[PDB]
Design a protein around this nucleic acid. Structure first.
Ligand SMILES: Nc1ncnc2c1ncn2[C@@H]1O[C@H](COP(=O)(O)OP(=O)(O)OP(=O)(O)O)[C@@H](O)[C@H]1O
Ligand SMILES: Nc1ncnc2c1ncn2[C@@H]1O[C@H](COP(=O)(O)OP(=O)(O)OP(=O)(O)O)[C@@H](O)[C@H]1O
Ligand SMILES: Nc1ncnc2c1ncn2[C@@H]1O[C@H](COP(=O)(O)OP(=O)(O)OP(=O)(O)O)[C@@H](O)[C@H]1O
Ligand SMILES: [Mg+2]
Ligand SMILES: [Mg+2]
Ligand SMILES: [Mg+2]
Ligand SMILES: [Zn+2]
Ligand SMILES: [Zn+2]
Lengths: 260, 155, 155, 260, 260
DNA sequence: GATCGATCGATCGATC
DNA sequence: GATCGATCGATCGATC
């Protein structure tokens, strides 16, 4: 049973991807923008679930490689680090395509990245956390989208909109957006129940997400998917650590007051 | 507002002149072109990482001057230049109001056209010239002597 | 962090791989070994003053690979090599991710194991390969094609 | 039974929304002003029940959000704090729409608020306690109602009318009003009985709101809905604390003399 | 006896770690967050005893090293200096793991730090004085906690909460907290007596922490553990310097008036 | 990156 | 019922 407990805590520590309507709308919109090479910018709140949805859109088109030609990668997903320069961004582009870089100038990196970007037939350039990179690199991404005809999606918090607003071309070129919703409503309750069935993966104790539990989780998460995930995982782990088979009211109260 | 380059005009001078015509900061031009801080680097003649084809074409798209013509605002391959001191032929400026990239060539000390030593600071008050992107008017920023009048003090 | 050499691995490739495992610059490895700038010379395949016994033993003390084994990362006596172009068999790299010193032998143009011409630049985008010490990942630094995938384009 | 007593006292502490003719007239008038984008100003006494009715008109049109576009919020309800400046008001507008602010000047906040206000397709701007905000902000709300075509309802006590009277444009532009009534009459008795049935939620002991009880409550509340709510809740809690199943005469006398 | 006096003054100068309920709660919470890789932020007052408790949680899991593999360090404790940049922080991370840095760019330091951080199997990243580092480094710590799955605890004064509040992602991601208590009460008296027995390490003169002494120490420390330690050590050293075997009333009065 | 920089905004209170 | 004058206090905003 101790081995089972370790397996349960390890599984609860690891996060999963429950496909819900938010990510469904997102990759539908992404496919629509991809079929037309339309460069947009998906925006949303923090800790709301944009990175996971972009990740899912990345894995669904797992590149299928030919026997002797470069693997064709339709969707490129990048999350450049803080104050990412042009050399760093190009390094990341050519590294995701599995082309190790060669020491050289910024022009050399640009040329190699362009070569490998046309070579693999890339369709999408998903730049998550697009509020980190310097504005001397937005010209480079503009040139990529202009000449190579690759639909670029700039992903980030609402601060990304402020970052691009002070610029001139990047704001006009990247204007289509898809704001991530708050999810509050009956769909939120559906989310809680679906999470209970799938992610918790606990024996059926008929918790059913009663009205009191819904009120507690509404007061706790404030609509955030990430907060919901964190609270659910913390409550499950705390119940399993103290021997409780299911999740009681005291643990939700404890985790809710610990958050707020 | 688009501008035609002057013959021999340096990249720094041209970029600043384009920015003044459009009320743009260096960061603003960089965002318009999608290359950010690179514009200000070029304006101060900093090219340790030399201008790439993609960067030149990005600027070319905004200013509507081909990358090949922009490359003629920099020294040819193998010609060394200096970011400092910024230099000037006042007699040239009187004929065409720009900084010439040739004045930053390490091998250049005399204007061939005018057979005068080129200037490395204002000959009236000794103030060094700013980077050419900041040559807003044609006068010394300190004493206000016109660059064209400095021709009379060239040796 | 110590690393076991791959069979046939070149000295440049091995030195860079050791440095990456230990977050060392070439100058840093040189200071650790007490021989300074010699490390970077060897990484670029420059051996005007061939590696001395004392220099090989100095590196051997740091990397914990005997000088005799380090000498097998260089051509045998009488075998001429070239510092340029850096070459690659992608089919070999797929089996063992290193640059082989044999690929710099002046007499070598074909991989005996794979019966393929070895590559002198990326066959996808024509970018030359960096010195092997800088082969940080197994991909072309320009187009990002994996070295292992270049096997499919070898003739 | 102690758990039941705790549940009863917790429920009695929490306030509810009984829909009566006052709020019915109010949201009918609000719908009429909304269909024409007519900016009015609902006025009334203090502790009479305007905030709750505006709140009900806010929740009835719960925003329905699209899969990937901003939620469309038809009614915006705000209650700016004391001496609310223009920056504070704009912050509140863009915060209710769930667009977190970015540090900047007042012009930046104004631009972002205008952008998010046209983005969500807002129809109503309900400014409760509209006697708090500075008169340098009435120009901003005037501009909002002028250019964005959003019917603004200024809610507040009769002091709001005095505040707007000393100004020139805000008085003329916002002239339609709906004064909240005193409710005294037979409709008041209907209110008492309806409150007894719904809000008290006590076992039927045939209190029926007799003539003596009506006289006591008339002398106590003076027509105020808020005073009626407070007196009823206090009497119920006092009866339940002393073990009395129903509400006696002594508790109404005690709460009435404690008030006056 | 003079050698004994020197030993006593040297011991009194050196500080110790008395384990009390505050640190017990703290490392219990830290173990709970570690078993789930949950990144939190412990907050508290100044001179209250958070650094010592985090230090104790650091030493309890003293890394056990294999014969020929890197030592596995489960808990990493850092206290970055004022205005700590990303390069400085990465230097500190790889220096604590006993991997001396190599000269290079910020990217090189980041890569080496990531390599050594996955190599040693680190579970915790305890950033004490987390109000010092620049906000261009919070993106780096966010990336660490996001990709490497290491629970980060941001430790600092209440100013750290203000520092993270103005940011967007770091506030949402790091929301679980454990405020350090004031300790005033009977537990405070227990603290005084326990300190007298252990830290003072003086011969038993039946001081017993009488009511007058408790009143003086309450007026002096205001609940701070650090102030209690300083006052006790100063009084002990002053008594031992003037020949007094035990601690008199005059020395507490002197140190109390010298503080306030 | 603090560092001014007015500035106006009540406000209030006597007082004649 | 005007009225006059002091006062202090956030506060955003440019700016070097
Ligand atoms: N489709 C999903 N299935 C499961 N969990 C999800 C999903 N979408 C989001 N999450 C949860 O959301 C949290 C993080 O979401 P994500 O990283 O995508 O945020 P984001 O919207 O990109 O925001 P940020 O920019 O603040 O990082 C995690 O707890 C993750 O489990
Ligand atoms: N429709 C209603 N249903 C239930 N209670 C109501 C209703 N309308 C008002 N109340 C009660 O009125 C009290 C407060 O009313 P509300 O806050 O709406 O006042 P208001 O008229 O806006 O006045 P004020 O400006 O003085 O706050 C509460 O006790 C609340 O329960
Ligand atoms: N468990 C403990 N045992 C002994 N002394 C302690 C303990 N906790 C704190 N102290 C005392 O507290 C003082 C400093 O505490 P600490 O450095 O941990 O503070 P902190 O809460 O992190 O605050 P700050 O951020 O202001 O430095 C020292 O005098 C130290 O002896
Ligand atoms: Mg994200
Ligand atoms: Mg009200
Ligand atoms: Mg501390
Ligand atoms: Zn000339
Ligand atoms: Zn081969």
């Amino acid at each position: 049973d101790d081995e089972w407990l370790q397996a349960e805590i390890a599984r609860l520590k690891g996060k999963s991807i429950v496909p819900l309507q938010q990510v469904k709308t997102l990759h539908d919109w992404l496919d629509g923008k991809r079929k037309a090479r339309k460069s947009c910018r998906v925006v949303g709140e923090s800790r709301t679930g944009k990175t996971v949805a972009c990740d899912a859109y990345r894995y669904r088109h797992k590149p299928q490689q030919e026997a002797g030609r470069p693997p064709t990668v339709p969707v490129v997903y990048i999350r450049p680090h803080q104050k990412c320069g042009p050399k760093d961004l190009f390094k990341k582009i050519t590294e995701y395509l599995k082309y190790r870089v060669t020491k050289g100038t910024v022009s050399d990196f640009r040329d190699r990245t362009i070569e490998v970007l046309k070579g693999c037939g890339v369709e999408m350039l998903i730049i998550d956390e697009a509020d980190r990179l310097k504005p001397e690199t937005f010209a480079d991404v503009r040139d990529i989208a202009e000449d190579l005809g690759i639909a670029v999606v700039l992903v980030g918090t609402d601060r990304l909109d402020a970052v691009i607003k002070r610029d001139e071309q990047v704001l006009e070129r990247f204007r289509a957006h898809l704001r991530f919703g708050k999810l509050s409503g009956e769909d939120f309750k559906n989310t809680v129940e679906m999470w209970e069935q799938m992610v918790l993966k606990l024996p059926v104790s008929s918790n059913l997400k009663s009205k009191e539990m819904l009120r507690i989780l509404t007061s706790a998460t404030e609509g955030y998917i990430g907060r919901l995930d964190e609270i659910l995982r913390e409550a499950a782990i705390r119940s399993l650590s103290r021997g409780l088979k299911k999740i009681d009211k005291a643990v939700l109260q404890e985790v809710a007051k610990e958050y707020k | 507002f688009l501008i035609k380059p002057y013959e021999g005009e340096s990249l720094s001078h041209f970029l600043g002149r384009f920015r003044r015509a459009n009320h743009l900061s260096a960061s603003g031009l960089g965002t318009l072109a999608g290359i950010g801080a690179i514009v200000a680097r070029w304006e101060r003649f900093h090219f340790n990482p030399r201008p790439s084809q993609q960067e030149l074409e990005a600027i070319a798209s905004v200013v509507e001057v081909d990358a090949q013509r922009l490359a003629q605002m920099l020294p040819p391959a193998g010609v060394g230049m200096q970011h400092e001191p910024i230099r000037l032929c006042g007699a040239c400026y009187a004929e065409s109001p720009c900084h010439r990239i040739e004045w930053q060539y390490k091998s250049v000390w005399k204007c061939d056209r005018h057979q005068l030593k080129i200037l490395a600071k204002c000959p009236n008050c000794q103030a060094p010239f700013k980077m050419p992107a900041l040559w807003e008017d044609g006068c010394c920023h300190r004493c206000r002597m016109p660059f064209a009048e400095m021709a009379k003090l060239q040796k």
